[PDB]
Short mmCIF file of C-alpha atoms and ligand atoms in Angstrom, two decimals:
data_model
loop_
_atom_site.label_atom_id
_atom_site.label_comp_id
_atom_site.label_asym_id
_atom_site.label_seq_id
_atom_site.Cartn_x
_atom_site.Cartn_y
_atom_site.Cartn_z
CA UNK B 1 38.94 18.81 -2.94
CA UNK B 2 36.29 16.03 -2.55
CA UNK B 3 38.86 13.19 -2.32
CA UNK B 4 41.28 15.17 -0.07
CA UNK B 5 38.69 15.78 1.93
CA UNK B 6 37.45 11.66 2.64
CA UNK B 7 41.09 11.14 3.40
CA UNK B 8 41.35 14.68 5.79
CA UNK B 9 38.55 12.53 7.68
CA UNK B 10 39.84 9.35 8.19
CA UNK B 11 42.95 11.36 9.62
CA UNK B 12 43.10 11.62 12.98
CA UNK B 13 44.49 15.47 14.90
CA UNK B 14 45.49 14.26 18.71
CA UNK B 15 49.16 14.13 20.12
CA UNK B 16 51.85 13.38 17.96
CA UNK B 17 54.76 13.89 20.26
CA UNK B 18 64.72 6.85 11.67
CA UNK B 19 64.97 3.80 8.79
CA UNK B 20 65.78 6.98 6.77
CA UNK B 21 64.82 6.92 3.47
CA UNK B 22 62.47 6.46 1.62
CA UNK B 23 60.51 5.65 -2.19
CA UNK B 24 57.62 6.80 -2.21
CA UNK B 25 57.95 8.37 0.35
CA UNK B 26 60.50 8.06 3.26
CA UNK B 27 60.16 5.79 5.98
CA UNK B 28 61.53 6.66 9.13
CA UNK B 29 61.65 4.43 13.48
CA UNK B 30 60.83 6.92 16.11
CA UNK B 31 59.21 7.26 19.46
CA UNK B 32 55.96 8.26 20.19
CA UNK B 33 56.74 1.75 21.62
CA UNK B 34 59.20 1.56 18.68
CA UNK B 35 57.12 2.32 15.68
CA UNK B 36 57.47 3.05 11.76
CA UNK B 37 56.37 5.83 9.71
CA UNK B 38 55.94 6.75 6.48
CA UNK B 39 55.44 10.59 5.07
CA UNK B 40 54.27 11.19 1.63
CA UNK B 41 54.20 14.69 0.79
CA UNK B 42 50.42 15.04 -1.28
CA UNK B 43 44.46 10.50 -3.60
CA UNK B 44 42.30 7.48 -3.64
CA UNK B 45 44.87 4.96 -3.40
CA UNK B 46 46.28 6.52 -0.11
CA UNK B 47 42.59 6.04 1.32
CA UNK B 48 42.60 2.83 0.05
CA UNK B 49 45.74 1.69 1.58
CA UNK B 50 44.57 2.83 5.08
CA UNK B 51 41.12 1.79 5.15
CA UNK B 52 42.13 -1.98 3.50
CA UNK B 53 44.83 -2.72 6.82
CA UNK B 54 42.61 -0.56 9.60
CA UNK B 55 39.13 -2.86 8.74
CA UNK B 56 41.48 -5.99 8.14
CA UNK B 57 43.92 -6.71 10.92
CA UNK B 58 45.32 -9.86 11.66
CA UNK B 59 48.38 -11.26 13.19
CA UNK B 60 49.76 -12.80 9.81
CA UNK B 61 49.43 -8.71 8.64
CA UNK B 62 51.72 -5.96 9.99
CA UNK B 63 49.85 -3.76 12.42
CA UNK B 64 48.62 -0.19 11.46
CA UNK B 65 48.70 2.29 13.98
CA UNK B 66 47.57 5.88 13.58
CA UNK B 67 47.52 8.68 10.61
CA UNK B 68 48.29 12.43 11.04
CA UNK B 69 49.26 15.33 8.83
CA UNK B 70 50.54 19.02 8.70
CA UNK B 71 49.75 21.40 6.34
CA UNK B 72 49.64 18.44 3.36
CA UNK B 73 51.89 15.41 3.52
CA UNK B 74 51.25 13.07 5.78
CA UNK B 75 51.61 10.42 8.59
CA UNK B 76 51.28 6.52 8.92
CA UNK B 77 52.50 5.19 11.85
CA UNK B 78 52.09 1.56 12.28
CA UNK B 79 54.25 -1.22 14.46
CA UNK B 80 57.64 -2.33 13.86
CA UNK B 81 58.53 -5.97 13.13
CA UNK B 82 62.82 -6.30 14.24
CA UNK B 83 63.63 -8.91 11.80
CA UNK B 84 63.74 -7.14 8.52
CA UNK B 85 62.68 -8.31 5.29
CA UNK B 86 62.57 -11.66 3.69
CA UNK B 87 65.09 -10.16 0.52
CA UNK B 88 67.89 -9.74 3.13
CA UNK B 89 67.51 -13.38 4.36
CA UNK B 90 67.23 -14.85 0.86
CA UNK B 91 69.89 -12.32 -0.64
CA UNK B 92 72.37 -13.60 2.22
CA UNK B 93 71.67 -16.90 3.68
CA UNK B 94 70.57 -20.51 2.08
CA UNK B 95 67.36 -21.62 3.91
CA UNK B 96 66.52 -25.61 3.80
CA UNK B 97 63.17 -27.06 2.55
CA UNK B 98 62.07 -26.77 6.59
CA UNK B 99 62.64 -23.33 6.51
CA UNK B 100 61.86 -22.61 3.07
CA UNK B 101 57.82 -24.34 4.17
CA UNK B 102 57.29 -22.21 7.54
CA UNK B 103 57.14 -19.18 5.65
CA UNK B 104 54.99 -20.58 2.65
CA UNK B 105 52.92 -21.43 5.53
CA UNK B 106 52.61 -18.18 7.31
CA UNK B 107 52.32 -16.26 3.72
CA UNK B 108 49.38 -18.54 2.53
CA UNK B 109 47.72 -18.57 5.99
CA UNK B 110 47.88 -14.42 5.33
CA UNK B 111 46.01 -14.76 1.87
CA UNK B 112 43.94 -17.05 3.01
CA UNK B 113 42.26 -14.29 5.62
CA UNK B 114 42.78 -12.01 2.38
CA UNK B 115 41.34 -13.78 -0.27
CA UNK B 116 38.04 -14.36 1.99
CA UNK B 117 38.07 -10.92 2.59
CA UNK B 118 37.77 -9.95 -0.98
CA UNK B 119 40.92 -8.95 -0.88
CA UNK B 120 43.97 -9.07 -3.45
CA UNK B 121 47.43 -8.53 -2.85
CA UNK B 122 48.66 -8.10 -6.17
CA UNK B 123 52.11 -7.36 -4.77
CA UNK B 124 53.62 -10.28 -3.14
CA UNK B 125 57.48 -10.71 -3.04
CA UNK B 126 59.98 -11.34 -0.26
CA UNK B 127 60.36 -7.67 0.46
CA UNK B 128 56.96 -7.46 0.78
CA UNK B 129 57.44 -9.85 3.56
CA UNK B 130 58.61 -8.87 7.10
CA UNK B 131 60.09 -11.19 10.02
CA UNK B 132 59.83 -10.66 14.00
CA UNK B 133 62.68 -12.01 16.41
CA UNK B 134 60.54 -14.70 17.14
CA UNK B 135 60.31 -15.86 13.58
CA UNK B 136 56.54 -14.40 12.87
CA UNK B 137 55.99 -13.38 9.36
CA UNK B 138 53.62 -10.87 8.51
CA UNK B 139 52.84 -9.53 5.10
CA UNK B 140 53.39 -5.14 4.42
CA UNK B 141 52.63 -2.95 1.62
CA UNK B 142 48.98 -2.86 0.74
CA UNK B 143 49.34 -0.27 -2.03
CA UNK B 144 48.13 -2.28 -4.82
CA UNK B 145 45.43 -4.16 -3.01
CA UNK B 146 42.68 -4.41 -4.82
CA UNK B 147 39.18 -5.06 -3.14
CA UNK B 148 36.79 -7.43 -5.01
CA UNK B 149 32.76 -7.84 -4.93
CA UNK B 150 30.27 -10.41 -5.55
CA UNK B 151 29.19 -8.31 -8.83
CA UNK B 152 32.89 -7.49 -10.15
CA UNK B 153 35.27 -10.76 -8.95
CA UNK B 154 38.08 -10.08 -11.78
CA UNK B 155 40.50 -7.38 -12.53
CA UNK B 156 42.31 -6.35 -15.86
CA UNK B 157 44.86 -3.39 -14.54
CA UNK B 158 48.48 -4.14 -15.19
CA UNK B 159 49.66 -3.64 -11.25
CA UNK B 160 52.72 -5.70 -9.12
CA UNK B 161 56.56 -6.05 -9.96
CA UNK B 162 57.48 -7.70 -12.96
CA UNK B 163 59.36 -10.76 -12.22
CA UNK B 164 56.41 -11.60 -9.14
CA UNK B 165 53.61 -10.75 -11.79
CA UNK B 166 51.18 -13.70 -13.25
CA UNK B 167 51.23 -14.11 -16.87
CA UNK B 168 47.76 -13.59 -16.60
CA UNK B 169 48.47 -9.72 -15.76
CA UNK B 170 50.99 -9.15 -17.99
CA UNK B 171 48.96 -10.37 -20.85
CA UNK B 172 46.44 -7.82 -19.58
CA UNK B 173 43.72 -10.77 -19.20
CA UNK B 174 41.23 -11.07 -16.46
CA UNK B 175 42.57 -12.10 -13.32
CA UNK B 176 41.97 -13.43 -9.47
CA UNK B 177 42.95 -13.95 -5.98
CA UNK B 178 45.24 -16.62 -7.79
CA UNK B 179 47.68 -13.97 -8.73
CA UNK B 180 49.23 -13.99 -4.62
CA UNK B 181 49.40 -17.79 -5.48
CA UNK B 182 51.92 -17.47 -8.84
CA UNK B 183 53.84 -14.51 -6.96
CA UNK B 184 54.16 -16.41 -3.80
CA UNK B 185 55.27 -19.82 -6.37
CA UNK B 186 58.25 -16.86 -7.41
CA UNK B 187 59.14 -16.24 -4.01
CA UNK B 188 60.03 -19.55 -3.85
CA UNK B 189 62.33 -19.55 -5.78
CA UNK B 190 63.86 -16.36 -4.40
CA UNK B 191 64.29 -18.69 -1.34
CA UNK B 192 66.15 -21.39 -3.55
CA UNK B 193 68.08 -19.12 -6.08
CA UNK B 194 68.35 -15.95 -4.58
CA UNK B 195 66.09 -14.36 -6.97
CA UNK B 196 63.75 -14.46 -8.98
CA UNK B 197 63.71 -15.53 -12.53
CA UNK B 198 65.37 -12.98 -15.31
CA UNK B 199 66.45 -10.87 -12.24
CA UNK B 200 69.27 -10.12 -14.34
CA UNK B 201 67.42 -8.51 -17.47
CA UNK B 202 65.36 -5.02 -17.20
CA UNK B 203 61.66 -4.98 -16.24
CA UNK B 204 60.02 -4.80 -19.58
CA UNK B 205 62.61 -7.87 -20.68
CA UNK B 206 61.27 -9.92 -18.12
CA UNK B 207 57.93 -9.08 -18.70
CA UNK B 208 58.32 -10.21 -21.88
CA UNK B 209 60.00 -13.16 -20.68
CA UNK B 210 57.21 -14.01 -19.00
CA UNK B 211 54.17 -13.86 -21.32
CA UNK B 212 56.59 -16.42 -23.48
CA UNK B 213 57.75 -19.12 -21.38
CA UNK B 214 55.07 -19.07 -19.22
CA UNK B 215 56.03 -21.22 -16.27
CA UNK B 216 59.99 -20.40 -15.36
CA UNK B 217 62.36 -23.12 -14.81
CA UNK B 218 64.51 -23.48 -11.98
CA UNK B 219 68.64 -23.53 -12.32
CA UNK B 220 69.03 -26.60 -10.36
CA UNK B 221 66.11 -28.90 -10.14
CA UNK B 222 67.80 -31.60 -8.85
CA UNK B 223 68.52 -30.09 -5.56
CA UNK B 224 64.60 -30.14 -4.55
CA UNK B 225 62.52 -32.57 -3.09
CA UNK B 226 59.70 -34.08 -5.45
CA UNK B 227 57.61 -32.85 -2.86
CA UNK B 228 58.43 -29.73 -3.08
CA UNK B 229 59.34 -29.77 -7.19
CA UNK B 230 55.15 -30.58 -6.82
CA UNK B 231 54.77 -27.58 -4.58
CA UNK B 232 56.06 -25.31 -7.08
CA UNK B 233 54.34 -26.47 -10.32
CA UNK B 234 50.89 -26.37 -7.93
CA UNK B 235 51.92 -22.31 -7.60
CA UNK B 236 53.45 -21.75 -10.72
CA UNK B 237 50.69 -22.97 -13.02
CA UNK B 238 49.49 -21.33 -16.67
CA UNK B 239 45.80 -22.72 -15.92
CA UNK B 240 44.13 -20.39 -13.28
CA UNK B 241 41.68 -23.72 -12.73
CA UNK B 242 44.43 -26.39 -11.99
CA UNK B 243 46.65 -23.50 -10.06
CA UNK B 244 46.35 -23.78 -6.31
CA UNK B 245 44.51 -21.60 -3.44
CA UNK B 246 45.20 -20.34 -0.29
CA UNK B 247 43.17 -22.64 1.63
CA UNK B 248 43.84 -25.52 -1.05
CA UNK B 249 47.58 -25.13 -0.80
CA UNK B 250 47.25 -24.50 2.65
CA UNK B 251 46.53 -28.73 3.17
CA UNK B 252 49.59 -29.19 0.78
CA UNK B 253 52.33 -31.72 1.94
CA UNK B 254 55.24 -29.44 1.20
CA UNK B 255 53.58 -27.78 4.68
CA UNK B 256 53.84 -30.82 6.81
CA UNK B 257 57.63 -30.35 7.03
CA UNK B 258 57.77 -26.85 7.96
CA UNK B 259 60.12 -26.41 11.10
CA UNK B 260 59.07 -24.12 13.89
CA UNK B 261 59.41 -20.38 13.37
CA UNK B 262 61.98 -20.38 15.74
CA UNK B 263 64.30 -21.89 13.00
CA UNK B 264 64.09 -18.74 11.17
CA UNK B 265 65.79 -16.55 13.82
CA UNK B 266 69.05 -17.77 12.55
CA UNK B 267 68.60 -16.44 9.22
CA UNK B 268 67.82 -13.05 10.84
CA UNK B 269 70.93 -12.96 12.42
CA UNK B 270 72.86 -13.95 9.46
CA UNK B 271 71.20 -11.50 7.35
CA UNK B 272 71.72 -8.99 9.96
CA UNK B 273 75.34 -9.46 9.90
CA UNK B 274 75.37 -9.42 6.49
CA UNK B 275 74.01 -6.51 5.81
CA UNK B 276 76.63 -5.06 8.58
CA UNK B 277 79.53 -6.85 5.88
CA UNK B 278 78.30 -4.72 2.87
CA UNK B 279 78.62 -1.30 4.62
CA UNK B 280 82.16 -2.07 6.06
C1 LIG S 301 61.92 -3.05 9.18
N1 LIG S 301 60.64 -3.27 9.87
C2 LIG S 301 59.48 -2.67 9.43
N2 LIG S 301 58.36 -2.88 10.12
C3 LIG S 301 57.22 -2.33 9.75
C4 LIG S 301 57.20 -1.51 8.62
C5 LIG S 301 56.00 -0.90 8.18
C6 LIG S 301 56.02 -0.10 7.07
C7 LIG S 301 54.76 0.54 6.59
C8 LIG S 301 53.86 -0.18 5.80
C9 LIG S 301 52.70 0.41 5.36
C10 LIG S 301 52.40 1.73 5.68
N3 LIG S 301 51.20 2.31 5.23
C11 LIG S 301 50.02 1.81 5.68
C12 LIG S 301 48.84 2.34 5.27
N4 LIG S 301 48.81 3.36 4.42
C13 LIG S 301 49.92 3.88 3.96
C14 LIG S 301 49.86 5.04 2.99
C15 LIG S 301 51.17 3.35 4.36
O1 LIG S 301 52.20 3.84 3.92
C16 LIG S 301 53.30 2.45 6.47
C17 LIG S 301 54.47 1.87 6.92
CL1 LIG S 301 55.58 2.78 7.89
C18 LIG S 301 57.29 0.10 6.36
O2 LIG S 301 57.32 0.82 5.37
N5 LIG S 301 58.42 -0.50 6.79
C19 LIG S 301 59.68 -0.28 6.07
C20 LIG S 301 60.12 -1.53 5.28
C21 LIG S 301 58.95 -2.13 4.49
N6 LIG S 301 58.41 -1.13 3.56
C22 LIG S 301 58.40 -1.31 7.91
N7 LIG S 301 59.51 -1.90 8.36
#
């Protein structure tokens, strides 16, 4: 109907001319430049997604493309970034405090141009976070984004993945821009540990898990720099007020000793081969 109809719009009806599969809903790499589409088979939160990336490009932000669609279903294409996702380079490789800074760098620089934007994430994590050969990281996934005004500047909806959500959202209190800050502290510690905390336990443990203890603690605190034990606390803070920003944490000293991006293509081809390992 009326809805159906914005998005039948915003569509576009020229020339149309695999990653396979697929959540919500499949994903495929075709040819029509290497590119990456998604096909959903048919809402506000579709229109949403597109409008969001197509009025807020940026280079720290993978790249939409172009939208079609058949009878229903239908057709994102956007650009493809070569390196894969951050999960299979923390889920395979150990990256040092240089490496572990450049992309803290690149992922604040990207909600800095958000969060300026009146724009929320809401769904940070590392596979949420996609590399090119040259080491670039952009941030994917705007499905939960949620758009903030000067009249409405807080949300109450319980939206993200557990173990990356704010205690502030899963206590259903009113929340910020400050909630890519906390998610991007628990990425962090994906790139120390692995994962993130209570990985191990269902969703609605950890969720419960997190209202409690608040801010997690890390396995082996020893092994990081005070510098970066500071960086942390700055993300993962209970107070919204004392809890870092974008452009605040963007100044941090954690930063300074970010290597070049280059240092991260490495890592991509570890995590490449790795992945190769768990099929064979
Ligand atoms: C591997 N490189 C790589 N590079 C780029 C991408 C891009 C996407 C990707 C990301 C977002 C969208 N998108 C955009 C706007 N509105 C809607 C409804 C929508 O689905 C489409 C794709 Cl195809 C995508 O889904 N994947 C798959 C993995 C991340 N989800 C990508 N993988």
């Amino acid at each position: 109907e009326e809805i159906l109809e914005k998005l039948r719009s915003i569509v576009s009806v020229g020339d149309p001319k695999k990653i396979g599969q697929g959540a919500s809903g499949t994903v495929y790499t075709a040819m029509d430049q290497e590119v990456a589409i998604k096909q959903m088979n048919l809402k506000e939160l579709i229109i949403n997604e597109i409008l969001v990336m197509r009025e807020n490009k940026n280079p720290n932000i993978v790249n939409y493309l172009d939208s079609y669609l058949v009878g229903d279903e239908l057709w994102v294409v956007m650009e493809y970034l070569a390196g894969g996702s951050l999960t299979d380079v923390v889920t395979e490789t150990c990256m040092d405090e240089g490496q572990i800074a450049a992309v803290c760098r690149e992922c604040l620089q990207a909600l800095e141009f958000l969060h300026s934007n009146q724009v929320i994430h809401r769904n940070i994590k590392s596979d949420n976070i996609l590399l090119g050969m040259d080491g670039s990281v952009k941030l994917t996934d705007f499905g939960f984004c949620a758009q903030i005004t000067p009249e409405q500047s807080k949300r109450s909806e319980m939206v993200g993945t557990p173990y990356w959500m704010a205690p502030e959202v899963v206590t259903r209190k009113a929340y910020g821009p400050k909630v890519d800050i906390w998610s991007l502290g628990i990425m962090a510690i994906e790139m120390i540990e692995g994962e993130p905390p209570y990985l191990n336990e269902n969703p609605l443990r950890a969720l419960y898990l997190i209202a409690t203890n608040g801010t997690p603690e890390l396995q082996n605190p020893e092994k990081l720099s005070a510098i970066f034990r500071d960086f942390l606390n700055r993300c993962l803070e209970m107070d919204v007020e004392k809890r870092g920003s974008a452009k605040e944490l963007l100044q941090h000293q954690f930063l300074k000793i970010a290597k070049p991006l280059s240092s991260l293509t490495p890592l991509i081809a570890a995590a490449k081969e790795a992945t190769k390992n768990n099929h064979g």
